Design a protein around this ligand. Structure first.
Ligand SMILES: Nc1nc2c(ncn2[C@@H]2O[C@H](COP(=O)(O)OP(=O)(O)OP(=O)(O)O)[C@@H](O)[C@H]2O)c(=O)[nH]1
Ligand SMILES: O=C(O)C(=O)CS(=O)(=O)O
Ligand SMILES: [Mn+2]
Ligand SMILES: [Mn+2]
Ligand code: NA
Length: 610
């Protein structure tokens, strides 16, 4: 079957068997083994044994450190050049640019980054040949979604990073059972290299292999391929998360009639035992993880977490919008995480957790800005840069984007349906972001079409547009994504969720937050809940429905300045509509659906009557 030894890499397999793999998977592995030239091939089985040995191996090499204070928890410190998902190096390849991003009138799209097939081929050839020399290629069979669920999708990731292997074991369902469920089915092809073949051409920093100059995270949806080079971090390297479950998946979703979104999913139960599920899209750094795992301050209310970051949603036969969490764990921002802001996260992460770029205490615990836990006198701190640190220093002890990576099943409020194969029925969708001025705590959209316009108008900070929290994550043209959302209104018998917009971040004139937030947000969720039940608790305004006077439970919060928090200004909202106008005109133009344009004019009109 070959004249020499062919593309047959059996001799280099140190775990599992190429014979055992489905034909197409074997082909994927062996093709990239020939290209990348790894010294060893490790087919992951997902076992506890494989995992313990992987960690020991990394520990042995100084790639990770054990955090002796906790049960099976580990710390990685990275090269300071590789500390986040990196948008500027993130691209989607399609035949025509306009299928990927709308053509901006001012020459630069904030809605994606296209690369031609030709330019990518050249970039690929400049990077991958021999890139794994001297390393192990790990083969990670993973399912996004509960194994065997009709909403689940399988990928194979090849990586030269054991850190990616460990993190993927947490954040996806990984191992032999996935290969068995796969059979001879289709899978997303995920290729990753840290881009540092041996012998090293450049010095290794903090035992963290990366290639910042050649970093390139590419998606080729027409080939069902994700190809990522040069970063070992987060969304650049854990390919199932953003690359697959948002970018690749949002385009599949458009073609197939479902949705793949940057949304938490939570189940909330009232004092009468009535439960509803909600989904919420907030941009990175705007508090999805706090809400998803909320400990409600209101007596007799309960919040349970389905997922904190990504939602796959599809209408069922009865018109219910069903959502699954395609993730298996939580990859949450560590700083700011405290008993006060996220007690349930505090409990989840003290075992079987990997931390990246946090500080370490001298008794082997973790530390970060906003942890709000004083240390005993004499306990000292090693920063994420691996030097002694004191609370007086200029720099933070933890990187602002440092993360924990923790099993979802350990969360004390994990939803009983968090793995149900049919998904949970969504009754409300919440949008929101950071709006220091002008936008009140909570409003309700007037219609599905107004709701989609409200998603389109979202912000990650007072000055930055992040429609639907998907700005860095659209798998195709944003204009067509709006058309896809609007199309859900025409699905016969669809039970369309109520759409709300929240704002935790309104400030008074001295910069102080007007709303205490966190667990207190339960008071906003109570209102949404009654609204879905059709309670007469809403007052119409030009921006949507707001809570009536007295509608919100504010007991315990008498110091809240209700007039400023809930206030609507004609002058603010005139500015807002003009801003939205310019933005949509510049960024979306020819691709903007009629309905979005009509909502813009309708809001303008309502404001004009103030
Ligand atoms: N004022 C206020 N801040 C909040 C609230 N909830 C979350 N935050 C802030 O939001 C940040 C934490 O949110 P992140 O974990 O970064 O957000 P995320 O949406 O989960 O982001 P990704 O994991 O990157 O998708 C911190 O600055 C928190 O203080 C709230 O109710 N009020
Ligand atoms: O940036 C985000 O929204 C994240 O959830 C982190 S990463 O998975 O993109 O690293
Ligand atoms: Mn998060
Ligand atoms: Mn996210
Ligand atoms: Na390190």
């Amino acid at each position: 079957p070959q004249l020499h030894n062919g593309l047959d890499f059996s001799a280099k397999v140190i775990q599992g068997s190429l014979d055992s793999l489905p034909q197409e998977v074997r082909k994927f592995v062996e093709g990239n083994a020939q290209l990348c030239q790894p010294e060893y091939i490790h087919i992951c089985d997902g076992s506890e044994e494989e995992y313990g040995r992987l960690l020991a191996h990394m520990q042995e090499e100084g790639v990770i450190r054990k955090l002796k204070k906790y049960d099976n928890c580990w710390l990685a410190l990275t090269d300071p050049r590789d500390v986040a998902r990196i948008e500027s190096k993130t691209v989607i390849i399609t035949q025509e640019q306009r299928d990927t991003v709308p053509i901006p009138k001012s020459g630069q799209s904030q809605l994606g980054r296209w690369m031609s097939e030709e330019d990518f081929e050249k970039a690929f050839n400049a990077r991958f040949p021999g890139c794994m020399k001297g390393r192990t290629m790990y083969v990670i069979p993973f399912s996004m979604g509960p194994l065997g669920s009709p909403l689940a999708k399988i990928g194979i990731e090849l990586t030269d990073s054991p850190y990616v292997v460990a993190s993927m074991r947490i954040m996806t369902r990984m191992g032999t059972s996935v290969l068995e469920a796969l059979g001879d089915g289709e899978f997303i092809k995920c290729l990753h290299s840290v881009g540092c073949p041996l012998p090293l051409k450049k010095p290794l920093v903090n035992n963290w292999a990366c290639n910042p100059e050649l970093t390139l995270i590419a998606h080729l949806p027409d080939r069902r391929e994700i190809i990522s080079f040069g970063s070992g971090y987060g969304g650049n390297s854990l390919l199932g998360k953003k690359c697959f479950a948002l970018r690749i998946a949002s385009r599949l979703a458009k073609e197939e009639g479902w949705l793949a979104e940057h949304m938490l999913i939570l189940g909330i139960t009232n004092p009468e035992g009535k439960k509803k599920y909600l989904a919420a899209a907030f941009p990175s750094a705007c508090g999805k993880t706090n809400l998803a795992m909320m400990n409600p301050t209101l007596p007799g209310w309960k919040v349970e977490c389905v997922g904190d970051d990504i939602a796959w949603m599809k209408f069922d036969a009865q018109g219910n919008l069903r959502a699954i969490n395609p993730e298996n764990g939580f990859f949450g921002v560590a700083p700011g995480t405290s008993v006060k802001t996220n007690p349930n996260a505090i409990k989840t992460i003290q075992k079987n957790t990997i931390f990246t770029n946090v500080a370490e205490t001298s008794d082997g615990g973790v530390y970060w800005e906003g942890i709000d836990e004083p240390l005993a006198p004499g306990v000292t701190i090693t920063s994420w840069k691996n030097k002694e640190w004191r609370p007086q220093d200029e720099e933070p002890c933890a990187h602002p984007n440092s993360r924990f990576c923790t099993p979802a099943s350990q969360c004390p409020i994990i939803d009983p349906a968090w793995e149900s194969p049919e998904g949970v029925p969504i009754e409300g969708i919440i949008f929101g972001g950071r709006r220091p001025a002008g936008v009140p705590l909570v409003y309700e959209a007037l219609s599905w079409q107004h709701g989609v316009f409200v998603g389109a108008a979202m912000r990650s900070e007072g000055i930055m547009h992040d429609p639907f929290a998907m700005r860095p994550f659209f798998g195709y043209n944003f204009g067509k994504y709006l058309a896809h959302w609007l199309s859900m209104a025409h699905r016969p018998a669809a039970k369309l969720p109520k759409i709300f917009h929240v704002n935790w971040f309104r400030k008074d004139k001295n910069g102080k937050f007007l709303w205490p937030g966190f667990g207190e947000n339960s008071r906003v969720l109570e209102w949404m809940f009654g609204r879905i039940e059709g309670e007469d608790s809403a007052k119409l305004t030009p921006i949507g429905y707001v809570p009536k006077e007295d509608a919100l439970n504010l007991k315990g919060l008498g110091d809240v300045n209700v007039e400023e928090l809930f206030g609507i200004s004609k002058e603010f909202w005139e500015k807002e509509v003009e801003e939205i106008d310019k933005y949509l005109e510049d960024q979306v133009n020819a691709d903007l659906p009629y309905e979005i344009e009509r909502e813009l004019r309708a809001l303008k009109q309502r404001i004009s009557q103030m």
